[model samples]
Target chain A: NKNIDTVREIITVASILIKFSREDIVENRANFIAFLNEIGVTHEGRKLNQNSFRKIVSELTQEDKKTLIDEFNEGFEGVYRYLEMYTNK
Target chain B: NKNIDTVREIITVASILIKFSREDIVENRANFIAFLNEIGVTHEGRKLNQNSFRKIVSELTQEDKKTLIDEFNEGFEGVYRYLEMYTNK
Candidate 1:
């Protein structure tokens, strides 16, 4: 089963890319799915399994998660730096 | 002082974005700095302090780090999903 801290890391990267990656990558499902393949997420070369990604983030309260997403978008460098200093074991 | 696992995560996200984010964001220093600010990495907004970010990733050997970046770029979805199932304590 997935744990809370692990969930946070996935959310961290997804939210970072969602908020900051190329507009074209996020432009539509096809492009987004292609981006996933390029990154080695889906080799099937079909539709994105949005639910799989969504479920990873489902451990947190929806509202808090949304707030944190906004926070991350606003402070990713500091947040990433902090994660660089603090996370993993 | 920073540690190795911490370095890996920063490298993970940066390499992901560098490979996948818009070319323009990674296109030039000024634009890249702007993207960092958008993500809250810098605020005083002068020239970028690349070394601060660079040093976080300096713990690993340059070759291995580059190889890992290639690996991440090729398999981010699997890499990210695996991360969600593990990591953190």
Candidate 2:
């Protein structure tokens, strides 16, 4: 429980954003989808499907997970805020 | 045209994010709204409305715009990617 679960954090954040996409709350939907694609969520459709998203999330390697979470934290204060509030060191 | 319009780009990106919020696409919606409030979009609502957002964008001073954009760009690769494609040095 004490150890940093980088994969869990990344999966949670990405899932949240995907949820946003599903709700039609994300502007630049294509860009967000593309970002997900860039990160490995290659589920086809106008947006990423949950099954594929989870599949890709599970498939990600440890190094990929590390690089992603770092970039995720680095690139979005919103992400940082959520991570801090719910999960942090 | 050649010189960067920092204010314009900041407004553009913030507006896009706000649009997402209104549509309900953002996860951590409260955090996103709080982030806007932190950056000075003080419109009172469950979410940031366009009018107040525009007002705040206009009211932001040059330095404020610079700081926000820097933090914005630093904190989100999505924002960075959007800015790079739409507006860049």
Candidate 3:
């Protein structure tokens, strides 16, 4: 039961990340980073370094950072899907 | 353009995988594996060997495989959100 809750929370966090990344706020990137920090997703010890960001984005071999940027630019429909799924469940 | 499309696809795939894992098909595990194979997701060289699967599933701290399984059992609402966002966009 606890594990299930944790998974749900993780999905929730992921969905929020996607949504935050898509917002048009003046400091979208800063806001996103701050949100991550607030949620303890990326904190002092695990603060996102350029290398880690590059690695996660790069880990998806067929996908690239440019693609993610474009997806965000496209208004984050993809990210929204994740959010919907998590909330609905 | 292509890179953007690729990112979209990756998100799409992630969404689907989440959904599949949550379903209650008679052979749910088999179906999930089959779906992964069908989508050209985990194929030939990059097939999800036990080690790799364990690694990815274990990479998330405090979140274990049991959590993922439970999330699936709770239904695939989280994954659906990803799909909805992608299609809406």
Question: Which candidate comes out best when scored by DockQ?
Answer: 1
lDDT of 2 by residue, A32-64 (tens): 444443333222212345444334434556675
Arrange candidates, best TM-score first: 1, 2, 3
Question: Candidate 1 on B21-54: residue-level lDDT in tens?
Answer: 4434433444443545454432122222555433
Q: Is the docking of candidate 2 incorrect, acceptable, medium or high quality?
A: incorrect
Question: Which wins on TM-score, candidate 2 or candidate 3?
Answer: 2
lDDT of 2 at B25: 24
**In candidate 3, what are the lDDT values of residues A1-89, reduced to their tens digit?**
12121222223344433433533321233443344333333312245443443333224323433443332432223443443333331
Superposed model 1: Cα runs more than 4 Å off: A1-34, A40-50, A62-89, B1-34, B40-49, B61-89
Positional deviation of residue B61's Cα in model 1 after best superposition, in angstroms: 4.5
Q: Number of the top candidate by lDDT?
A: 1
Better of 1 and 2 by TM-score: 1
Worst 10 residues of 2 chain B by lDDT: B1-10
Over all chains combined, what TM-score does candidate 3 have?
Answer: 0.24
Q: Which number leads on TM-score? A: 1
TM-score of chain A of 2: 0.30
Identify the runs in model 3 with alpha carbons over 4 angstroms from their true place. A1-14, A17-22, A25-27, A42-45, A63-77, A80-89, B1-89
Question: What CAPRI class is candidate 1?
Answer: incorrect
Q: Which wins on TM-score, candidate 1 or candidate 3? A: 1
DockQ of each: 0.16, 0.03, 0.04
